Paper text:
The apo structure of nADSL shows an identical tertiary and quaternary structure to that of hADSL, consisting of an all α-helical homotetramer that differs between the two variants with a RMSD (root mean square deviation) between Cα atoms of 0.5 Å. Structurally, domain 3 is the region which displays most of the structural differences between the apo forms of nADSL and hADSL when overlaying the tetrameric structures. However, this difference originates from small rigid body movements (of less than 1 Å) of the complete domain which can also be seen when overlaying the different protomers of nADSL (or hADSL) separately. A superposition of the separate domains 3 of nADSL and hADSL shows that the Ala429Val substitution has no effect on the local structure nor does it influence the local hydrogen bond networks. The SAXS curves from apo nADSL and hADSL are identical and fit well the theoretically calculated curves from the corresponding apo crystal structures (for q-values between 0.07 nm−1 and 4 nm−1). Hence, consistent with the results obtained by the structural comparison, nADSL and hADSL have an identical in-solution molecular structure in their apo state which is well described by their respective crystal structures.
Numbering used by the authors:
A (entry chain D): 8 to 288, 293 to 475
B (entry chain C): 9 to 281, 296 to 473
C (entry chain B): 8 to 284, 292 to 479
D (entry chain A): 9 to 387, 409 to 481
The structure:
Amino acid sequence: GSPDSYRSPLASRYASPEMCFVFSDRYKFRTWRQLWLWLAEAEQTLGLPITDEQIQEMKSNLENIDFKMAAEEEKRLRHDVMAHVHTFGHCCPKAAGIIHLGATSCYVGDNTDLIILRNALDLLLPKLARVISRLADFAKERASLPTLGFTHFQPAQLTTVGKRCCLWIQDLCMDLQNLKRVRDDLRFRGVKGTTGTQASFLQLFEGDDHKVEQLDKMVTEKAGFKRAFIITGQTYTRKVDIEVLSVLASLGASVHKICTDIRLLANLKEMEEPFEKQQIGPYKRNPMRSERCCSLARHLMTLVMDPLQTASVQWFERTLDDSANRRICLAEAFLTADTILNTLQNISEGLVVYPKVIERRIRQELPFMATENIIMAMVKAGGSRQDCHEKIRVLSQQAASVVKQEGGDNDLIERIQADAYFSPIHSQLDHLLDPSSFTGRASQQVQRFLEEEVYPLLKPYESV
Amino acid sequence: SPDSYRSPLASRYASPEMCFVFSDRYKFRTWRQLWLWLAEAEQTLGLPITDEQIQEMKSNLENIDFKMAAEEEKRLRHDVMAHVHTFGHCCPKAAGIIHLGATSCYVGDNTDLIILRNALDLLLPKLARVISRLADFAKERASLPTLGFTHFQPAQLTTVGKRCCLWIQDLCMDLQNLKRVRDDLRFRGVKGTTGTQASFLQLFEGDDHKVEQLDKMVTEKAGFKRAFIITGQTYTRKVDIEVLSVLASLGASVHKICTDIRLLANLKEMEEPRNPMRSERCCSLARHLMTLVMDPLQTASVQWFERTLDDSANRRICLAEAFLTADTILNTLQNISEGLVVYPKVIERRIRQELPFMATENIIMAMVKAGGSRQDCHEKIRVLSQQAASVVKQEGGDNDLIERIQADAYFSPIHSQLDHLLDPSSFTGRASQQVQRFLEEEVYPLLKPYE
Amino acid sequence: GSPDSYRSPLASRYASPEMCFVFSDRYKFRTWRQLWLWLAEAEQTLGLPITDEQIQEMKSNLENIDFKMAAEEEKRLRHDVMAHVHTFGHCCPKAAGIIHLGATSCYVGDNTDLIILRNALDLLLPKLARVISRLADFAKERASLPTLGFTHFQPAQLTTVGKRCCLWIQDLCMDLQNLKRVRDDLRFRGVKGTTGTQASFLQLFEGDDHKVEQLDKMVTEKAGFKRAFIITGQTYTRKVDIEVLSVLASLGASVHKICTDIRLLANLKEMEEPFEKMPYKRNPMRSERCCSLARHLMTLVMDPLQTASVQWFERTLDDSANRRICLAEAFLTADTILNTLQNISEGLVVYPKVIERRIRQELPFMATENIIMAMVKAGGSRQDCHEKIRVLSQQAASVVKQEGGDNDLIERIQADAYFSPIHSQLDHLLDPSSFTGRASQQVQRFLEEEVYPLLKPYESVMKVK
Amino acid sequence: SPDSYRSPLASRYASPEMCFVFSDRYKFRTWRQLWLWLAEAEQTLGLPITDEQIQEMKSNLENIDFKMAAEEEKRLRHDVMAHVHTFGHCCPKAAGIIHLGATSCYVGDNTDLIILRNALDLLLPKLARVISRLADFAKERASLPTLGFTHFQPAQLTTVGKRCCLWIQDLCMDLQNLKRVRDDLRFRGVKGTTGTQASFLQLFEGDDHKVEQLDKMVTEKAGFKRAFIITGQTYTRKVDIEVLSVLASLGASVHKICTDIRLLANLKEMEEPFEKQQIGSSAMPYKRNPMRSERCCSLARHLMTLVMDPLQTASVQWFERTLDDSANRRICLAEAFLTADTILNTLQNISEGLVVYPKVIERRIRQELPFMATENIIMQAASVVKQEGGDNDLIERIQADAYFSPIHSQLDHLLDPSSFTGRASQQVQRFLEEEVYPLLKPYESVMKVKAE
Ligand SMILES: [Cl-]
Ligand SMILES: [Cl-]
Ligand SMILES: [Cl-]
Ligand SMILES: [Cl-]
Ligand SMILES: [Cl-]
Ligand SMILES: [Cl-]
Ligand SMILES: [Cl-]
Ligand SMILES: [Cl-]
Ligand SMILES: [Cl-]
């Protein structure tokens, strides 16, 4: 692309070449020809006057596409499909008269879109499986590392770095399920005619309903779909595009949340994005990859409104106000998702943790959450609950004033150590303030989660 | 009071049953229910709770002093502790063990899940019922030809019932979505302030097994098959995305269906049980259902760590509104579907005006079959078509293409064929067989469990 | 009402009584009657058979509204306007025959919607002005107080607490200007008939176009509007609802940003929400609520965008139920947000020693160029000094991250005799006020030039809490 | 290359001029322009910058080595520093003073503002031309009666021109909104990395007036009347909301207009203009699809969808800036303007020679009018129509009944369609003179430019 024209940053800058190719005109028109080859093979099988020589010349010329010629013919014809029937028949002169036999434009246009959507999903699925797997390794590594919990982004009951990572993983697992469900349930349009009635194919087969049904089943199987619609207008219902982009929107919400947490952890200096390759010969580090993931994820959420609106105002058996919008949103949704998953994998590969910063923060906040434990110990040693409460309240106030009014380190535990009133529990104080004892069931939750929910989910993706 | 704003969703639009599901009575009775279950399970697991305490709670689930709870909430600045205190007031014997070990979201967030599920349960039979009425209609009208439209321009004929199947199929997809979401909803259970169950762990003196039993048992008592293992304070707000996304997609389906119905009313081919007001209302509400999807998308995207409370007010609005809106739509769509009136004579007249321009191909094939040239016959049709089209558009007159073809001696080999060549049923392709196969394979089996 | 049914929390928990009333049935049907009165007044002036007695009796019974009779008459008739014509005629027996004369439903329905939108904008405006004024006071108070700057939420060139407050204030001033513009530019529908062509009134005035135009002008002026549409279909263009809810959505975005910043400052213990009628751990719950509701305001913009987009011809009635929801909810949501944000703004809590400690931890890493320059001025080498400061800074950075320790960079500089030509200077070189650039002067000029002048019209309502 | 994806906005849809405004060439020449302006102002303010340094920069604003700059961005990990280095290579005399005292968003963010303003400037005349073509049409059809539609059911007659005025008025509102947003855009200027101008205050050795002078000077050289006083790192992202919200609302207007045209096309009352290849063709198709209208709807829909991107972005900016705005804005701001530009090009084409069939219009009026004239006559046919799809026979029944003898001779006059259109034709004329013409007058000199 020239620097003198706009180039989508989703092609040029962001997405992988594999996803870029799925949405390319090369892939599109090659798949159009592929569909025409399948149609010819099935029509031959069903008794139509098509030869093995005609089939073989189509098969040899699936990739040999004259784009200049197609574009020229599209000018005079003003019909993209017929422009390509012409260009295909030019390089396939024996087969020319039977290309597109009995079909309408959407046999190629709309089935190709479904193949594209399915192949795009099949590119995302393994990438999403891989990021989940890398985060699972991290979660298990850090399963028992105590970290300050945050509710309202204020100190709260301690969690572990790995348990927090499980919140992230779980949302991504829900995405993996949704994506796989939408992919697997996607139906083929098949051979349906202009308004879905198969009137053209019925006539071609001389009123033979069984042959129309069989043809529909054969192209569906050749394209590798399990199932075709029975009911369509001109195209697959545009409710499908809502299903697909809704699950991508939800994925975007998940990633926006995870990468927001990561950016906040980076401010706290508890976690940072992976160190990047050394240049031959820094204190401050910006979580730029997580920022980019948020930025893009937002756009994936935004896009959901396109297919919602499109579907809601489709009139009868189709209106073509779906077409320009789909050319933008379907491709953009997938290229944005791809980019996000490529970046998130890169974030996952060697996340940096600073346990001494984490520890320090716990030591600042934990004492204000440990006071019932200190009361219980005093009471167990023969002390008075009332007096211990009154005394803890006063020392706690003193420490809180050091922290806020003076900008000091929390000295509550040191106040308690120095006060002879707490003499009966001074020897227990390290044990009573052990952060691992305040993480509840965090580490066991990680283990049960990974074994019962995450590994089983990943198992079938081990091939790809 | 007419002196204050009153939700049009509550007063005007939605059913009393769905309004009740989102009422404070339902909410606070469910808080008490969850406190009962917690005590029952805690007793089984060895905690000092008596049968008398449990029976007292059980006799007072509905006995709620909303005035006291609202006054205590002003004092304590804490809705849950306000309801603990109020419940303890009418249950003095149980008062010390209500909420034992629990945190606020044990009642708040589990109650939301209960509500979401019961609201889906109310929608499910309504949607099946609509699909069923429309299916009866599609079957009745499976063979009735009607003009096809692409670009809202005359196209290959369909049937009234085949078109109806486009509508039915989107609604079947909605039905399956709502059911999946309903069945897959998991319980929060007992999870603590940050999801670690630390408060329960301490209540059980470090016994993990007891914590896991408690979680299993309250989940069972609430009638859920599964609880989360992993939470922060609350169930992941991704769940609310999943729920409102299926409602939004439902709204898109309804808007499309009710748009087609409004267009059919302009064409005088079909009417609702004279303006298509029910269909307009459906569209108007369906649009709001689509808009609402952005609320939970945004919310989940900016939850920090184990929860921020910027979810709360938003969810009070969007969750209830989405369900109350969806309910109204289904009640209205039910009324539309019970009384669709078709005017076959209007349909027939429109077909007779448009069909000739679409029959030019079959006229050419018949001339060929009695000897003629393809290219001669195309050019003869082209001139007569051009003339008929001028009469239609330039003169505002009825289409005379068939009369033109009869009056031209060239078409003598065909003249006696013309009535049959332009029989509308012969242009509907496989429409009626598609209806029957769709109803038997796809719709009936879906509906059978609901009947 | 009853706890046995849904009650919108916008009406029952969140919005002010005044905003709730603007969207009430009482207000709506009083305004219908008002519009009937004005119609009758203008109709008499242009010579229609309407007497002072008939007029005086409508004026007497503007508020005397029997809702039960209106509701039963609507159940019988299934037309809200005719039900209200009949109910108004019942208590105005002498005027009954002239009420609604020559008008169509939207004369009352749609003109009332405009009067509501305008009144609702008028309630928001002074609330937004008060928030701006409280925050201006804060920005002035805190103009010179250094604080750590944040880009990517990482340490950056110091700002001041007041300068950062001006980021918030500016966006709110842009919202105030938008709300006012929209309020001012709102046009009346006036008298337009069923399809915008004024046929009913043309015929009522026996073909006199001048009298139809005068009626339109006169009802418009009686309703307090400067200007009526020339062109309508049945109703005002629904593009208007986009204009109004877009400005509210943008206000939501500003508030969401501001309150997200406050939430982050509260985590950092630098700023907290005002003390309520001293606990160590405090949650920024008002700010969280403002974010929550601001989000809904943003969401709602998609309602009028979609509605306008699919209006067929001179009106389709698929706008009606949606507008009953989104127009009221957006204003009630905005009202709540403004009431809450004004509360947040009254007595914000700042912890300067927390702010100072954080600066002391981060500033040395940003001071290393000021130090190099002071070495270069006393003789030394830019490149020499750069390599020595890099090694010590790396050591200090490792104390911070690998050990969880306080930053010791200035201590390591103090203890290294290579820096002896600048040891006397270090206190001055590390003065935080010298790192805030022009923050304090920016505050002063902004408040003088851009904020105080916007507030000037609202001075008489400024002091309410 | 057809072997990767390419935005259909760049290749297929938008005009080359809008495409260029969002191009890398435009971007990076604008960086260099801003660096030149900076140097010129800094020279005036006394910094050691020579006329030769300035002239060397001025001679190389367009001489951009994209390949080298990309490679340098990879080495330095910094887009601005890559461009500083690459510009210093072609301007070795100036190399030492390029970007002097500035920070990254001096070029990045000011360039975005120049782009936004340029883009708006391209849209305005296009919209003005649409409005003018429709105003021509409205005027010529001001009196042509046509069936009014409420609920898309027969309602009080309007006129083809009056109906077109509904479309025009929405677009006039868009044109005023676009103009306001363009006029109100402020320059970021020189603000530093957190908005405090610290780097410039240091460059000028603590002289505040010099910093203020530099901000004023770069703002003036860039053609902006006003700079922000207050920024963080960048201009407030509220500005992006303001700009995309006006485009969204334009999208809504265009969707409604093009939905009406599609419905009229179904009714055969109005069609999209004959394409060049069809004009006078003896091969004119009977069935014409309103494809340009469909396209405009489809695109206008995306415009409306995009409004959620800047809403969300602004809402979650933390403090003096977070860089989660960057990728999103790269997408949405360019897409919104390419989509709008496409819509306006197409809509201008639609507006130039709309096809009207008065005899179709007339026949539909005769079907519905007898039912709307009963009031005037007092001074079954419905069941036939509904059950038989027959022609309306109400008038024919009336002339053949004894009872209506007093009225019979008026029945032609009483059914005159012109008498049912109310004030539609006068409304058109007052609207055009008072509200439309005055808005178009600034655009007189570019009215004649053709559809693309
Ligand atoms: Cl894997
Ligand atoms: Cl077909
Ligand atoms: Cl096909
Ligand atoms: Cl806990
Ligand atoms: Cl709990
Ligand atoms: Cl009228
Ligand atoms: Cl009126
Ligand atoms: Cl700076
Ligand atoms: Cl700068």
